[PDB]
Design a protein around this nucleic acid. Structure first.
Lengths: 92, 77, 74, 65, 77, 77, 66
RNA sequence: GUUU
């Protein structure tokens, strides 16, 4: 439940998403779910080569199981909040 | 009069078992124990890779083999 | 019975193979029901201990459970 | 996060193997299993099926065209 | 418990092996039981074998979330 | 409507399954469960789409299906 | 369950596994989890003869008759 | 039993 909480505070913030199959996509995080699925509004191209076969599409749904990376800015995130929250989380 | 798979594995305890992964690799050893998930304890396992097949290692003591990757069990090797 | 094993070998020197082939030799600090493993004084080798040493971690090593193919004592 | 806003609309689907589809999205469940109609191969522009059911394990991306 | 001995080095530099010859070095901000991670100030090394030869690529990022299912290993550099 | 409901009522129809290995299975659906495990009668399986074994009944695990082509008849049936 | 394995006891079945293995055997036993007990098991990889094998149901992909 |  912790990373769901993390991703909720990122709504309305531009993020880059790297999918396992080497697809990279810039977008505004509009929505997040329990599986960490993502909905990105105002889609844009970070890399020339990696970027897939889109165009008119400006809104996408990304399956959480297929993401490798979500690239953030250090100002989007309070580190100490993250740390104390991880410390709190129980893993058993 | 039904024959249950886990009863068959229960009977092969203290015998030699072949354990075949879903990959090429195989483990032959003495079946010490197993759980409900088919995690498995082997004693002095010979670890193989299969086709000329190279024998990876000779274990000594006890191995816990994750049942997550196990496709087949053969009783008495 | 597999749990009795998990607590029987804690503190002993083990080999932990992963899916990839990579093998880790260390002292078992801790284990969890998800097969997650903690080792200390660990080395990595590919397939066999007799092969070339690929790394020596002076620090503690956390190996993910989903990835472990066995844990074995020597 | 939900595929609700896409119902009955045309969509681009990128599969995990990098394959591409164009289709009308008609049904979906919580595991992302899709029900599709008038499916085509994006690259190929080749008509695949009038109706098709696609497992979620296969999906990587769905876009609203 | 191995997941608690990971809290031990929160805000400490970590080394992470991933599936596909990827490596990450970053300062540990957050994790869960899924092994999902957040790292700050991170550099990611990719070892590729193209044209039968080995090159290693790099990628720097100030903050990154890592889906935990590709994670294989966590230690310190 | 939901994919599963759709399947549950396509019972008795003809349909074509593509599996994760490439094998194609043409048959008439005889049963579905909540995990999309199927059983079909009057079966013909192919090694790939290029095409041929005829089988009386087949059981297919749902985790192994890439997609299922339905008969155009579906919506009204 | 949706498949009644009882009608297949003492018949020869074909079982395709995850990771591309084929196994034809005689069905001796089964469980609700689709774990099988095969006899005269032949694993097709071209030919390999195991005997009385236990197949894990979690990795089972397909099951037909023979 | 599909997103660890």
């Amino acid at each position: 439940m912790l990373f769901f909480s993390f991703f909720k505070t990122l709504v309305d913030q531009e993020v880059v998403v790297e999918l396992k199959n080497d697809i990279e996509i810039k977008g505004t995080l509009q929505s997040v779910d329990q599986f960490l699925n993502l909905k990105l509004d105002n889609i844009s191209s970070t890399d020339e080569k990696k970027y897939p076969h889109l165009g008119s599409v400006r809104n996408i749904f990304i399956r959480g199981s297929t993401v490798r990376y979500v690239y953030l800015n250090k100002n989007m995130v309070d580190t100490n909040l993250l740390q104390d929250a991880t410390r709190r989380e129980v893993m058993t | 009069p039904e024959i249950l798979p886990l009863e068959v594995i229960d009977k092969t305890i203290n015998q030699k078992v072949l354990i075949v992964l879903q990959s090429n690799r195989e483990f032959e050893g003495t079946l010490v124990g197993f759980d409900d998930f088919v995690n498995v304890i082997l004693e002095d396992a010979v670890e193989w890779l299969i086709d000329r097949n190279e024998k990876v290692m000779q274990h000594h003591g006890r191995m816990l083999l994750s049942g997550n990757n196990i496709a087949i069990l053969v009783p008495g090797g | 019975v597999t749990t009795e094993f998990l607590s029987d070998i804690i503190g002993k020197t083990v080999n932990v193979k992963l899916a990839s082939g990579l093998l880790y030799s260390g002292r078992l600090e801790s284990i969890d029901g998800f097969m997650n493993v903690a080792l200390s004084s660990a080395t990595e080798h590919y397939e066999s201990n007799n092969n070339k040493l690929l790394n020596k971690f002076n620090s503690d090593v956390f190996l993910r459970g989903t990835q472990v193919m066995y844990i074995s004592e020597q | 996060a939900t595929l609700k806003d896409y119902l009955n609309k045309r969509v681009v689907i990128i599969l995990v193997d990098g394959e591409s589809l164009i289709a009308s999205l008609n049904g979906f469940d919580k595991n992302t299993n899709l029900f599709l109609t008038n499916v085509f191969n994006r690259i190929s522009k080749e008509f695949i099926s009038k109706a098709q059911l696609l497992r979620g394990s296969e999906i990587a991306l769905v876009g609203l065209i | 418990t191995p997941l608690d001995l990971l809290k031990l080095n929160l805000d400490e530099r970590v080394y992470i092996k991933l599936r596909g010859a990827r490596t990450l070095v970053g300062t540990l901000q957050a994790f869960d039981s899924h092994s999902n991670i957040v790292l700050s100030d991170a550099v990611e090394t990719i070892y590729q074998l193209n044209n039968e030869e080995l090159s290693e690529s790099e990628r720097r990022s100030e903050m990154v979330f890592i889906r935990g299912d590709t994670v294989t290993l966590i230690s310190t550099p | 409507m939901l994919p599963l409901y759709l399947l549950t009522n396509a019972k008795g129809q003809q349909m074509q399954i593509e599996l994760k290995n490439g094998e194609i299975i043409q048959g008439i659906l005889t049963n579905v469960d909540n995990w999309m495990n199927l059983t079909l009668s009057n079966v013909t399986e192919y090694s790939e789409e290029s095409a041929a074994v005829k089988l009386n009944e087949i059981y297919i695990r749902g985790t192994f299906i890439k997609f299922i082509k339905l008969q155009d008849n579906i919506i009204d049936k | 369950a949706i498949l009644d394995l009882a009608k297949y006891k003492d018949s020869k079945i074909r079982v395709k596994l995850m990771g591309g293995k084929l196994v034809i055997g005689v069905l001796k036993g089964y469980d609700q989890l689709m774990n099988l007990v095969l006899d005269d098991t032949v694993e097709y990889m071209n030919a390999r003869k195991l005997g009385l094998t236990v197949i894990r149901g979690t990795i089972l992909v397909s099951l037909s008759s023979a």
